[PDB]
Structure 1
Amino acid sequence: MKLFAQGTSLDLSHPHVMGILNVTPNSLIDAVKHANLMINAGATIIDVGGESTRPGAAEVSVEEELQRVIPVVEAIAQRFEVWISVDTSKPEVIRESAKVGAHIINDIRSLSEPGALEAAAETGLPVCLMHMQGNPKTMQEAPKYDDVFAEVNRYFIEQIARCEQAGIAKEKLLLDPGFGFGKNLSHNYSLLARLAEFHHFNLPLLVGMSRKSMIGQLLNVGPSERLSGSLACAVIAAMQGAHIIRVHDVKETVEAMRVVEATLSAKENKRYE
């Protein structure tokens, strides 16, 4: 399995580590310094995001998001060979990010915003479809599912069809069950335990559990104390054949992924279920 964008390809025969580069508040110099460190630590994708996914923040204007995101995507694309994912829901940011070299559109809202689907289709870039119950402002009030796995799985079926209808072929899609997005602790572990069953779509799986409450609430530790839990999550998902792991702690995750790959390559069937 492979993805193609901007004249290069990403080989998904082993797990990739995607480093988080938050550009919400010198800003450009600092972002590039951080990118450089993450690449050096072995990140093969850098996820650039300029709108907080937090509960009460006003949505950032299109002009402010462009100012935070585009110069950063641009500076990374012209210095490094790394893949760049852009964490946006706005069509204009999608368009302008593609123009300066972004490889993956990583929308937490799965292109639900007006125009976003058409803009993503126009760029021809890979698109990540992430499950979220409701919207970021209220999704954590009262998450509820009768069957969280089936509900997430159904969402993927629907969203795939929506993308295909807009001209975005299956081969461009990645799926992400959206850890922490309208999910309590037990919902998150039900999804993680069954993650391998999402392979039936024959699409790349991306996960992001790094430093999230599904670790914090389980261990009763603060946000700076979650590395060991974050590594355990990453390993659990990668052992089940997750293709991309989105993280804060790149060096440590890359090391863990090398251990996973050595294990998977000694296994006859290449996956745990």
Structure 2
Amino acid sequence: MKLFAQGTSLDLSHPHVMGILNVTPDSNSLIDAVKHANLMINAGATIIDVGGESTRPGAAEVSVEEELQRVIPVVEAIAQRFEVWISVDTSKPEVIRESAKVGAHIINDIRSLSEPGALEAAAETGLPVCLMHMQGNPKTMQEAPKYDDVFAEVNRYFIEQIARCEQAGIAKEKLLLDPGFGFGKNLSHNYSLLARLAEFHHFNLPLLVGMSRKSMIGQLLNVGPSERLSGSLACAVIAAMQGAHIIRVHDVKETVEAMRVVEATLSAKENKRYE
């Protein structure tokens, strides 16, 4: 299993660590962003995820001009200084288009190209696209998350969105699937998805997961956001043992170390996965 973008490839026979580079200001961003990316690359991240719109519960929307200002210079600088792959965490067709031009490898849209023109703009780049499940939108998703059967519903959603991208001329082989931990889900919904994650392999597509420092850990352990490293590594290991291909994290070094132990364990397994 491999992805192709920007005249290079990514080999997904072993788990990759995707380092989070949030570039939403809180009350020199370009230089600090590149310093941060550098540490993460040295720590072993093989993909950096650049995000200019907070997608957290309750988050406010960001204008296209502001998102571009935050994201595009950062993507460019990384693409010319380093060789690491670059995912852009955006829903906006103009950010998708512009990101690609300055060297982005993966469109990582939490809205799965649901915005006007997103689907065509992503098709136009030819880049790999990650489709994520979210119930509702970031402003209201955590109000009252509800499923009769969360796995079945997320699974159906992936069927529908794969089709949607196929119809738009994006081939199955470009797609990644992310069950969207924390995006319109309570505690038990998240753990049901984590527990049954290997069953999403039936699509024969790369799985991407992001649980780092999330409330599914915070609420379970009753610890604050800075106190979640051990819990984050447990979630990472659990996902990667079930054949998850990309692990989106804040703490790169520690995750990279944990993924080696997982790689050593899987290569000594006969069938290369846990279920």
Category of TM-score, reference length = shorter chain: over 0.9
Root-mean-square deviation (CA, aligned residues, Å) is 0.5
- Local SS of the residue matching 1:180: coil
Q: CA deviation at 1:16?
A: 0.1
Q: State the distance in 2 between where 1:268 and 1:133 align.
A: 37
Is 2:20 aligned against 1:23?
A: no
Q: CA deviation at 1:170?
A: 0.3
- Local SS of the residue matching 2:131: strand
Matches within 5 A, 1:106-121: 106-121=108-123
> Any stretches of 5+ residues in structure 1 without a counterpart?
none
Deviations 1:202-226 (A, max 9, x none): 0000000000000000000000000
Q: State the distance in 2 between where 1:221 and 1:245 align.
A: 22
Q: CA deviation at 1:55?
A: 3.2
Q: CA deviation at 1:58?
A: 3.0
Q: State the distance in 1 between where 2:172 and 2:75 align.
A: 25
Q: State the distance in 2 between where 1:60 and 1:148 align.
A: 30
State the identity as a percent.
Answer: 100
> Any stretches of 5+ residues in structure 2 without a counterpart?
none
Asked whether the 8 Å contact 2:210–2:249 carries over to 1, the reply is yes
Deviations 1:215-239 (A, max 9, x none): 0000000000000000000000000
Q: State the distance in 2 between where 1:56 and 1:20 align.
A: 20
Q: CA deviation at 1:56?
A: 3.3
Q: State the distance in 2 between where 1:17 and 1:3 align.
A: 15
Q: CA deviation at 1:54?
A: 2.6
Q: CA deviation at 1:147?
A: 0.4
- Local SS of the residue matching 2:9: strand
Q: State the distance in 2 between where 1:137 and 1:46 align.
A: 25
Q: CA deviation at 1:173?
A: 0.1
- What is the match of residue 80 of structure 1? 82
Q: CA deviation at 1:59?
A: 1.1
Deviations 1:11-61 (A, max 9, x none): 000000000000000010000000000000000000000001133343111
Q: CA deviation at 1:178?
A: 0.2
Aligned length: 273
Deviations 1:235-259 (A, max 9, x none): 0000000000000000000000000
Deviations 1:125-150 (A, max 9, x none): 00000000011110000000000000
- Local SS of the residue matching 1:191: helix
- What is the match of residue 140 of structure 1? 142
- What is the match of residue 259 of structure 1? 261
- What is the match of residue 215 of structure 2? 213
Q: State the distance in 2 between where 1:122 and 1:182 align.
A: 30
Asked whether the 8 Å contact 2:60–2:139 carries over to 1, the reply is no
- Local SS of the residue matching 1:48: strand
Q: State the distance in 2 between where 1:120 and 1:223 align.
A: 33
Matches within 5 A, 1:154-165: 154-165=156-167
Matches within 5 A, 1:156-235: 156-235=158-237
Q: State the distance in 2 between where 1:235 and 1:154 align.
A: 26
Structure 2 length-normalised TM: 0.99
- Local SS of the residue matching 2:113: coil
Q: CA deviation at 1:102?
A: 0.1
Q: State the distance in 1 between where 2:95 and 2:249 align.
A: 23
Q: State the distance in 1 between where 2:132 and 2:193 align.
A: 13
Gap change, CA 1:155 and 1:105, over 3 Å in 2: same
Q: State the distance in 1 between where 2:165 and 2:123 align.
A: 8
Q: State the distance in 2 between where 1:117 and 1:233 align.
A: 31
Asked whether the 8 Å contact 2:59–2:138 carries over to 1, the reply is no
Q: CA deviation at 1:268?
A: 0.4
- What is the match of residue 4 of structure 1? 4
- Local SS of the residue matching 1:77: helix
- What is the match of residue 56 of structure 1? 58
Q: State the distance in 2 between where 1:125 and 1:64 align.
A: 23
